[PDB]
A paper describes a structure:
The genome of the mildly thermophilic hot spring purple sulfur bacterium, Allochromatium (Alc.) tepidum, contains a multigene pufBA family that encodes a series of α- and β-polypeptides, collectively forming a heterogeneous light-harvesting 1 (LH1) complex. Here, we use the purple bacterium Rhodospirillum rubrum strain H2 as a host to express Ca2+-bound and Ca2+-free Alc. tepidum LH1-only complexes composed of α- and β-polypeptides that either contain or lack the calcium-binding motif WxxDxI; purified preparations of each complex were then used to test how Ca2+ affects their thermostability and spectral features. In both complexes, each αβ-heterodimer subunit bound two molecules of BChl a and one carotenoid.
Thus, LH1-α1β1 and LH1-α2β1 were used as models of the Ca2+-bound and Ca2+-free complexes, respectively, and their cryo-EM structures were determined at resolutions of 2.45 and 2.78 Å, respectively. Ca2+ is coordinated by Trp44, Asp47, and Ile49 of α1 and Trp47 of the β-polypeptide. The Qy transition of the LH1-α1β1 and LH1-α1β3 complex (both containing the Ca2+-binding motif) occurred at 894 nm, whereas the Qy of the LH1-α2β1 complex lacking a Ca2+-binding motif was at 888 nm. In the presence of EDTA, the Qy band of Ca2+-bound LH1-α1β1 and LH1-α1β3 complex blueshifted by ~10 nm from 894 nm to 884–886 nm, and the addition of Ca2+ recovered the Qy to 894 nm, similar to results with native Alc. tepidum LH1−RC (reversible shifting from 890 to 882 nm). Collectively, these data indicate that Ca2+-containing Alc. tepidum LH1-only complexes exhibit nearly identical spectral characteristics to the native LH1 complex, and the Ca2+-dependent redshift of the LH1-Qy transition is independent of (or unaffected by) the RC complex. By contrast, the Ca2+-bound LH1-α1β1 and LH1-α1β3 complexes contained mainly anhydrorhodovibrin (C41), a precursor of spirilloxanthin. Among the three complexes, the Ca2+-bound LH1-only complexes demonstrated markedly higher thermal stability than the Ca2+-free counterpart, and within the Ca2+-bound LH1-only complexes, the LH1-α1β3 complex exhibited greater thermal stability than did the LH1-α1β1 complex. For the Ca2+-bound LH1-α1β1 and LH1-α1β3 complexes, a major peak was observed at 80.5 °C and 88.9 °C, respectively.
Author numbering:
A (entry chain C), B (entry chain E), C (entry chain H), D (entry chain J), E (entry chain L), F (entry chain b), ...: 6 to 47
O (entry chain Y), P (entry chain a), Q (entry chain W), R (entry chain F), S (entry chain U), T (entry chain D), ...: 2 to 54
Amino acid sequence: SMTGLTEQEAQEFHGIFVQSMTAFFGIVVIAHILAWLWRPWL
Amino acid sequence: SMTGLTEQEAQEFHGIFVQSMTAFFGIVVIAHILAWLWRPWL
Amino acid sequence: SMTGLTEQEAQEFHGIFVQSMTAFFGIVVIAHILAWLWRPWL
Amino acid sequence: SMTGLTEQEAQEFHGIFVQSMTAFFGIVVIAHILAWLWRPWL
Amino acid sequence: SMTGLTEQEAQEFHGIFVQSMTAFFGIVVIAHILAWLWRPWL
Amino acid sequence: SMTGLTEQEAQEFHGIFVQSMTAFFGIVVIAHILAWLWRPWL
Amino acid sequence: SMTGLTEQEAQEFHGIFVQSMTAFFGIVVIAHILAWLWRPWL
Amino acid sequence: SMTGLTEQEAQEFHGIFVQSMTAFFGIVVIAHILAWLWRPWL
Amino acid sequence: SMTGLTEQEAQEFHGIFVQSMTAFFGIVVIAHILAWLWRPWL
Amino acid sequence: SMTGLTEQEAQEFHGIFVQSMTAFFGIVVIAHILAWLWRPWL
Amino acid sequence: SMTGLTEQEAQEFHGIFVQSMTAFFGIVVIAHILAWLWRPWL
Amino acid sequence: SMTGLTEQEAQEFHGIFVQSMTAFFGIVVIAHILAWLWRPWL
Amino acid sequence: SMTGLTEQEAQEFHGIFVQSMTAFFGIVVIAHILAWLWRPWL
Amino acid sequence: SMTGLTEQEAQEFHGIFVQSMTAFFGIVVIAHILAWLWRPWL
Amino acid sequence: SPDLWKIWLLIDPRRVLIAVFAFLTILGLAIHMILLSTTEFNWLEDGIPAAKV
Amino acid sequence: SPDLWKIWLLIDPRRVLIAVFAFLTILGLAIHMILLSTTEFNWLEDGIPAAKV
Amino acid sequence: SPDLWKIWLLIDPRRVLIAVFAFLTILGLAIHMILLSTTEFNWLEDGIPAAKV
Amino acid sequence: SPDLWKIWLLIDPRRVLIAVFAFLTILGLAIHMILLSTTEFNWLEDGIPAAKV
Amino acid sequence: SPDLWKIWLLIDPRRVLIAVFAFLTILGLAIHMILLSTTEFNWLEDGIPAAKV
Amino acid sequence: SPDLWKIWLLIDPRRVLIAVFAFLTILGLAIHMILLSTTEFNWLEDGIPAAKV
Amino acid sequence: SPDLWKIWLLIDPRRVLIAVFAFLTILGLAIHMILLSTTEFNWLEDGIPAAKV
Amino acid sequence: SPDLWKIWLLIDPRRVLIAVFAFLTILGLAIHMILLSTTEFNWLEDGIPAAKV
Amino acid sequence: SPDLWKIWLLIDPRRVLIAVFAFLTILGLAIHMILLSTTEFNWLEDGIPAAKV
Amino acid sequence: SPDLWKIWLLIDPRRVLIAVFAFLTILGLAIHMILLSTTEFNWLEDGIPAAKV
Amino acid sequence: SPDLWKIWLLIDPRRVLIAVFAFLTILGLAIHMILLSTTEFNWLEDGIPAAKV
Amino acid sequence: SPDLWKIWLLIDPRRVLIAVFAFLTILGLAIHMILLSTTEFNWLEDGIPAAKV
Amino acid sequence: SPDLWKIWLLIDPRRVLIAVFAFLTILGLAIHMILLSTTEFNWLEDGIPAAKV
Amino acid sequence: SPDLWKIWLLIDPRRVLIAVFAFLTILGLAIHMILLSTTEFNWLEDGIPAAKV
Ligand SMILES: COC(C)(C)C/C=C/C(C)=C/C=C/C(C)=C/C=C/C(C)=C/C=C/C=C(C)/C=C/C=C(C)/C=C/C=C(C)/C=C/CC(C)(C)OC
Ligand SMILES: COC(C)(C)C/C=C/C(C)=C/C=C/C(C)=C/C=C/C(C)=C/C=C/C=C(C)/C=C/C=C(C)/C=C/C=C(C)/C=C/CC(C)(C)OC
Ligand SMILES: COC(C)(C)C/C=C/C(C)=C/C=C/C(C)=C/C=C/C(C)=C/C=C/C=C(C)/C=C/C=C(C)/C=C/C=C(C)/C=C/CC(C)(C)OC
Ligand SMILES: COC(C)(C)C/C=C/C(C)=C/C=C/C(C)=C/C=C/C(C)=C/C=C/C=C(C)/C=C/C=C(C)/C=C/C=C(C)/C=C/CC(C)(C)OC
Ligand SMILES: COC(C)(C)C/C=C/C(C)=C/C=C/C(C)=C/C=C/C(C)=C/C=C/C=C(C)/C=C/C=C(C)/C=C/C=C(C)/C=C/CC(C)(C)OC
Ligand SMILES: COC(C)(C)C/C=C/C(C)=C/C=C/C(C)=C/C=C/C(C)=C/C=C/C=C(C)/C=C/C=C(C)/C=C/C=C(C)/C=C/CC(C)(C)OC
Ligand SMILES: COC(C)(C)C/C=C/C(C)=C/C=C/C(C)=C/C=C/C(C)=C/C=C/C=C(C)/C=C/C=C(C)/C=C/C=C(C)/C=C/CC(C)(C)OC
Ligand SMILES: COC(C)(C)C/C=C/C(C)=C/C=C/C(C)=C/C=C/C(C)=C/C=C/C=C(C)/C=C/C=C(C)/C=C/C=C(C)/C=C/CC(C)(C)OC
Ligand SMILES: COC(C)(C)C/C=C/C(C)=C/C=C/C(C)=C/C=C/C(C)=C/C=C/C=C(C)/C=C/C=C(C)/C=C/C=C(C)/C=C/CC(C)(C)OC
Ligand SMILES: COC(C)(C)C/C=C/C(C)=C/C=C/C(C)=C/C=C/C(C)=C/C=C/C=C(C)/C=C/C=C(C)/C=C/C=C(C)/C=C/CC(C)(C)OC
Ligand SMILES: COC(C)(C)C\C=C/C(C)=C/C=C/C(C)=C/C=C/C(C)=C/C=C/C=C(C)/C=C/C=C(C)/C=C/C=C(C)/C=C/CC(C)(C)OC
Ligand SMILES: COC(C)(C)C\C=C/C(C)=C/C=C/C(C)=C/C=C/C(C)=C/C=C/C=C(C)/C=C/C=C(C)/C=C/C=C(C)/C=C/CC(C)(C)OC
Ligand SMILES: COC(C)(C)C\C=C/C(C)=C/C=C/C(C)=C/C=C/C(C)=C/C=C/C=C(C)/C=C/C=C(C)/C=C/C=C(C)/C=C/CC(C)(C)OC
Ligand SMILES: COC(C)(C)C\C=C/C(C)=C/C=C/C(C)=C/C=C/C(C)=C/C=C/C=C(C)/C=C/C=C(C)/C=C/C=C(C)/C=C/CC(C)(C)OC
Ligand SMILES: [Ca+2]
Ligand SMILES: [Ca+2]
Ligand SMILES: [Ca+2]
Ligand SMILES: [Ca+2]
Ligand SMILES: [Ca+2]
Ligand SMILES: [Ca+2]
Ligand SMILES: [Ca+2]
Ligand SMILES: [Ca+2]
Ligand SMILES: [Ca+2]
Ligand SMILES: [Ca+2]
Ligand SMILES: [Ca+2]
Ligand SMILES: [Ca+2]
Ligand SMILES: [Ca+2]
Ligand SMILES: [Ca+2]
């Protein structure tokens, strides 16, 4: 629309964006599980 | 597309970029193993 | 490509660049060996 | 090329540049030998 | 060339420049000899 | 109209916006329920 | 008039604006009743 | 005239302005009566 | 003239201006009488 | 002349200006007489 | 000339200027005589 | 010449300038004689 | 020439300049003789 | 010439420049001889 | 003055409305600051009703 | 006034909405800061409910 | 002067009105600040009527 | 109001989304700072669970 | 001088009026401030009439 | 919402990746600074494992 | 000099009048400040006539 | 994601490379400074191997 | 030199007059300040004639 | 990667050379300064060889 | 040099005159300040002739 | 490399010469200052040869 | 060198003259300040000839 | 190098002359400052020859 992307372009970018964000949240979760095992804060 | 690169250009740049990033990550991993052997922090 | 350089020009520059960087790294390595013999830090 | 110099111009400038740098480095080396004789730092 | 000078102009300027620089260096050398006779620093 | 959006475009954006805001508000309610269980402030 | 809105547009915007103001004021009133029950200030 | 408003436009704006100002002044008067009952300052 | 106003309109503005200034001065005079009754300063 | 005013305009402005200045000066004189009666400074 | 004034204009401005300056100086002289009578400084 | 003045204009301005400067210097000399009589500084 | 002055103009300006500078230097010399008589500094 | 001067103009300026510099140097030398006779610093 | 409505033929009604709203808001904020800066009329620190902290 | 809707023919509704939302947010932030600066109404540093630290 | 109305042919009535209103508001704020900075005329801290805090 | 969707014909959805995201992030950061600035709700300096340093 | 009215053919009457009004206002404010900065002529802190506070 | 992909028709995907990457990097730096400023979670100065210096 | 009137063919009468009036006002203000900065010529703080405060 | 290579059709490879190199250099400098600011990991000031000065 | 009048063919008489007037005024102000900063020539603080305050 | 030479088709070799030389010079200066700021590795203030001063 | 008059074909006589006058005035002011900053040559504070204050 | 001369087809020889000369001068000044800031290598304040002052 | 006059074909004689005059004046002022800052060569505060103040 | 004269085909001889003169003057000033800042090489404060003040 106002970004110049087509609908298919937006839906494939959304898929890749969410996949990458999910992978990033998985490493952050392992990292936080490791940090909780190392030194819990609550 | 938005950057003016061709799909083949983007693919080959991505391959070289990931290879260089893997080499850099391997050197940093060796450096951090040496740092842990020298003086562990956890 | 986007720098105005030909592929042959890029290859040649890369070769000379890597040769010069290797020479600089060798000089740096000799200097660091001398510095470790003079006063080791680890 | 990029600087507008001819290859012969670049070669001859490089020769004069390396000669002048060698002379400057020799003067610097003599000065540092004199400084070491005057007061060694290591 | 780059400065707009002719080769003969550059040679004659070089000659006068080195003559003046040599005269200045001779005056400086005499001044430093007088300073050393006055109060040596080394 | 003033934003250049169509009425259907505005309606669908409003629907998605309200859904996303409701999801965000639901996550913040659990975050706050968990915080109140952890350490009530009133 | 000087805002580019029609009289009908201004009327309907005013209706929605006042309805939203009433909803916000009711939420604020409930919050202030809760605050007075929690800790009266006068 | 100077503002581009018509005489009828100015009259109607003045009427609405004075009505709104009177309502605001009445609310302010009630608030100040409540403040005086709460804590007289004079 | 210099401001673009007609003579009738300057005389009209002046009448309304002097009436409003008189009303403001009367309100101010009442306020100052009240202040003197409350706490004289001289 | 250089202000764009006519001689008659200048004379009439001068008359009104001096009348207003005399009125202001008389008010100031009354105020200073009152201030001297209240608290003489010399 | 340089200011655009006529010689007659300059003459008459000079006359009025000197008359006004004389009046101002006379007022200042009266003020300073009063100040000396009130509190001499030398 | 370079100021737009003619020779006669410059001569007459010089005459008036020097006359005014001489009058100013005479007033200043009288003031300094008075200041020396009042309180000599050397 | 470069200043736009004629050679005769430059000569006459130089003559007047040196005359004025000589007069200024003579006045300064008289002032310094008076200062030395008043209070010598060496 | 980068300055716009001719060879004759450059030579004749150099003659006057050198002579004026020599006169200035001779006055500085006598001043310095006077300063050494007054208060030697070495 | 019955012709006080004519003032809107000189000063822009929108500009006057914006300025009046802004000035009234700033004035209210300033009055609340002045009252809270005093001890007698700081309703938050006055101790009424009786304090819990 | 029944014709209070005519104010949107004078002041831009979108600019008024932006200004109102920004001012209300700033006002809420300011009130929460004022309350937290006090001792009687800082609900976080009050002691209620009973502390753990 | 009977012809004092002619001043509005010289100074713009709108700018004079704006300047007069702004100056009067600033003057009133300044006077209230001056009174509040004194002890005898600070009606908020004067202790009258008798304090609660 | 059923016609609350019409607000996107006045305020730009993209600008509103950007402002909302930025404001929410800043608000969360500020609240976490305020909680960390206190003693009762600084979950890092609370001593809970029992300290090792 | 009977021809003093000719000064308005040189200096703009509107500019002179504006400058005179501004200068007189600043001068009055300055004089009142100077008087208040003293003890003998600060009519607010002089103690007359007899104080309440 | 199934149509959440439509947000990239509104906000530019490249500007969001740059903002997201920059913001996440800044957030990580800030969190590591906050942890290092504490005593309980400064893993470098905590004493564990047992010191050499 | 009888031809001193010719100075107005050189320096602008209006600019000269403005500069003279401004300089004289500043000079009078400066002299009054200097007198008030002294003890012997501060007619406000002098004690004369005899004080009330 | 197999199509992660398409990110270079969106963000400029050269700008990304420059930013990555600069950020990594600044990050390495910052980490080395943080380590040198601590007693336990300042390998220069530690005493190991045994000192000469 | 009899041709000293020729200097006005070089330096503009109006600028010279303005500069001379300004410089002489500044010089007089500076000299009066220097004298007032002394004790022997401060005619206002010298105590002559005999003080009242 | 055998195709690492292609990076010079993306980043300008002259700009990279200038940046690399400048960065290496700054890095060397910084390392020498860090070493001089310490006691163990200040080869000038070390005492070795034995002092004269 | 007999041809020293030729210097005015090089440097502007008007600019040179202005610079010379300004520099001489500044130099005289500076020398008078230096003399007044000393004790032996401050002719205003030297006590000579014998003081009255 | 035998084709190290080709670097002058990339970086301007004049700019490189200017930068090299300026950097070498700055570096020499810095080294001399660093030596003067120490006690062991300040050849001016070392005492050698034996002092006169 | 016999052809030292050719330097005026390169550097502008007027600019060189103005720079030389300005530099020499500044140098003389600096030397006089340096000498006046010393006790041994402050000819004004030396005590020679014998003092009067 | 016998072809060292060709450097003036690259760097402007006039700019080099100006820079060299300025740098040499600044260097001489700096050296004289450094010498005067010391005690052993301050020829003005060294007490040689024997002092008069
Ligand atoms: C169609 O054609 C093209 C070319 C477009 C196809 C190509 C598409 C491609 C290749 C797409 C690629 C997409 C990618 C790589 C996407 C990656 C997305 C990622 C990694 C997203 C990550 C998101 C993370 C988020 C949103 C995190 C948010 C965190 C927040 C808001 C944290 C807040 C914290 C607060 C408020 C407080 C913290 C406590 C403090 C620190 C303040 O105190 C203790
Ligand atoms: C073809 O046509 C033309 C006209 C072009 C022909 C003409 C050609 C000509 C005439 C060419 C002339 C060429 C010339 C004159 C070349 C001269 C070259 C020179 C003198 C080169 C010198 C180079 C020196 C270098 C690169 C030195 C580098 C030193 C470094 C980087 C030092 C670093 C120090 C560090 C990081 C730290 C030090 C520790 C401190 C002391 C700071 O703290 C403890
Ligand atoms: C053909 O047509 C034309 C018109 C072109 C012909 C005309 C040609 C003419 C007339 C040419 C004239 C040429 C002239 C007059 C040339 C003059 C040249 C001179 C005087 C050159 C002098 C050079 C001096 C140099 C480069 C000195 C360098 C000193 C250095 C770098 C010192 C460094 C010091 C350091 C780093 C540290 C010192 C330690 C301190 C003291 C600072 O702290 C302890
Ligand atoms: C039709 O074509 C298109 C392309 C347009 C279709 C696409 C549409 C799409 C994809 C739409 C997507 C929309 C989305 C993703 C919307 C998301 C909306 C969200 C998440 C909204 C969230 C809103 C939250 C708000 C407004 C929260 C406000 C909170 C406030 C104002 C809090 C104030 C607090 C105060 C004043 C004080 C607190 C106490 C302090 C912190 C000061 O002290 C303790
Ligand atoms: C013909 O077509 C049109 C459209 C033009 C017709 C319309 C005409 C209309 C509608 C006209 C409306 C006119 C209006 C509304 C006029 C209002 C005028 C007002 C209210 C005037 C008020 C004036 C007040 C004045 C000038 C007060 C001056 C006070 C002064 C200068 C106080 C000075 C105080 C000093 C210097 C020091 C005080 C001591 C302190 C307290 C500061 O410290 C101890
Ligand atoms: C023909 O068509 C038209 C339109 C032109 C006709 C219309 C004409 C009209 C309507 C004209 C209207 C004219 C008006 C209204 C004129 C008003 C004039 C006024 C009010 C003049 C007032 C003047 C007051 C003056 C100049 C006061 C000066 C005071 C001075 C300079 C005081 C100085 C004090 C000093 C330096 C120091 C004092 C002691 C301190 C304050 C420092 O404390 C120790
Ligand atoms: C031909 O057509 C036209 C229109 C041009 C004809 C008209 C011509 C007319 C009307 C011409 C009018 C000319 C006038 C009015 C000329 C007036 C000239 C005056 C009054 C000249 C005055 C000159 C005064 C001078 C130059 C004073 C100089 C003082 C100096 C430099 C003082 C220096 C003091 C020093 C350095 C140190 C003092 C000690 C300190 C204060 C520093 O410490 C105690
Ligand atoms: C042909 O057509 C025309 C129109 C051009 C004809 C007209 C020509 C005319 C009318 C020409 C007029 C020329 C005039 C009036 C010339 C006047 C010349 C004067 C008065 C020259 C005076 C020169 C004085 C000089 C340059 C003095 C220099 C002093 C120096 C540099 C002192 C330095 C002191 C130092 C560095 C240190 C001193 C000690 C300490 C630092 C303590 O002082 C503060
Ligand atoms: C027809 O064509 C034309 C018009 C061109 C013909 C006309 C030609 C004419 C009329 C030419 C006139 C030429 C003139 C008047 C030339 C005058 C030249 C002069 C007076 C030159 C003087 C030169 C003096 C120099 C350059 C002195 C230099 C001193 C230096 C650099 C000292 C440095 C000291 C240092 C760095 C440190 C010292 C120790 C300190 C001061 C710091 O104390 C510890
Ligand atoms: C026809 O086509 C279109 C597209 C135009 C149709 C669409 C129309 C639509 C969709 C319209 C939507 C409108 C909306 C959503 C409007 C919402 C309006 C709201 C929520 C308004 C809320 C207003 C609240 C106000 C104005 C509150 C004011 C409070 C004030 C001024 C408080 C002041 C307090 C002061 C000065 C001091 C207090 C004490 C302190 C805080 C300082 O503490 C001691
Ligand atoms: C087709 O034509 C062309 C010309 C395009 C073909 C050519 C293609 C070529 C030649 C491509 C070449 C590509 C290259 C050389 C790519 C190299 C890529 C590399 C080396 C990538 C490296 C990446 C490293 C990353 C992303 C590291 C990230 C680290 C982060 C974000 C760390 C953050 C830390 C935080 C925020 C928190 C804690 C750290 C602190 C310091 C705070 O802890 C105390
Ligand atoms: C075909 O036509 C042409 C003209 C193109 C042919 C010509 C080609 C030519 C002539 C090419 C010439 C190429 C040259 C001369 C290349 C030279 C390359 C060099 C010397 C490269 C050197 C590279 C060195 C690097 C990249 C070093 C990196 C070091 C880093 C990043 C260090 C980081 C440290 C950190 C962040 C942390 C710790 C350090 C501290 C000090 C903080 O620890 C306490
Ligand atoms: C015909 O077509 C159209 C579209 C034009 C028709 C539409 C017309 C419409 C819709 C008109 C709407 C008009 C409205 C909504 C008008 C609203 C007016 C209001 C609310 C007016 C309120 C006025 C309040 C005033 C003027 C308050 C003034 C207060 C002052 C000046 C206080 C000053 C205080 C001072 C200087 C001193 C003491 C206070 C302190 C705080 C210092 O004491 C310690
Ligand atoms: C023909 O057509 C037209 C329109 C041109 C005709 C019209 C002509 C008209 C109407 C002309 C009107 C002219 C007027 C009104 C002229 C008024 C002139 C006045 C009042 C002149 C006043 C002059 C006063 C002077 C010059 C005072 C000077 C005082 C000085 C320079 C004091 C300096 C003091 C110093 C530097 C040192 C000591 C003072 C301190 C304060 C430092 O002591 C402690
Ligand atoms: Ca309360
Ligand atoms: Ca609580
Ligand atoms: Ca009260
Ligand atoms: Ca915890
Ligand atoms: Ca009173
Ligand atoms: Ca640890
Ligand atoms: Ca008195
Ligand atoms: Ca170590
Ligand atoms: Ca006296
Ligand atoms: Ca050593
Ligand atoms: Ca004396
Ligand atoms: Ca030594
Ligand atoms: Ca002496
Ligand atoms: Ca000596």
